[PDB]
Ligand SMILES: Cn1nc([C@@H]2O[C@H](CO)[C@H](O)[C@H](n3cc(-c4ccc(Br)c(F)c4F)nn3)[C@H]2O)n(-c2cc(Cl)ccc2C(F)(F)F)c1=S
């Protein structure tokens with residue numbers, strides 16, 4: 126039981142084989158969730174499940190550089206459900222972030238931001254109740 130928006134410091138940034146686990150419960154009638162892996166003001170990886178974009182559920186991923194959003198990467202496979210407990214796992218790999226939700230693989234997002242050791246904050250926000258936010262090395 127933690128407050129949303131929540132900031133999780135990633136001391137010294139991220140590194141391959143670093144696994145970030147976020148546990149929580151989606152609120153009933155949710156509109157959006159966002160995970161923002163930040164390098165200062167830039168967003169190295171924005172993971173954004175949208176429950177109602179043109180009456181469809183979509184996961185939108187992007188990068189924000191110098192306050193400009195890049196080319197979006199979209200995924201129609203949508204494992205979240207309003208009112209349900211979830212687990213999101215972000216596994217930092219050499220060339221991409223690998224995302225798995227509720228122990229099932231979801232997507233990969235290739236690194237556009239290369240200074241991994243400077244992505245030192247994960248912002249967690251949106252239509253959820255947050256239970257815990259932590260990391261370990263596998
Ligand atoms: C309908 N739409 N939405 C976007 C932006 O698309 C981005 C990904 O490409 C981010 O999702 C961004 N966004 C979302 C939030 C956000 C906040 C609060 C919570 Br709580 C939370 F969950 C959150 F997602 N803050 N910024 C969002 O505003 N764009 C978009 C897309 C691109 Cl490529 C470039 C520019 C834009 C923009 F200028 F129009 F914004 C459109 S078009």
Ligand SMILES: [Mg+2]
Nearest residue numbers: 206207208209
């Ligand atoms: Mg339902």
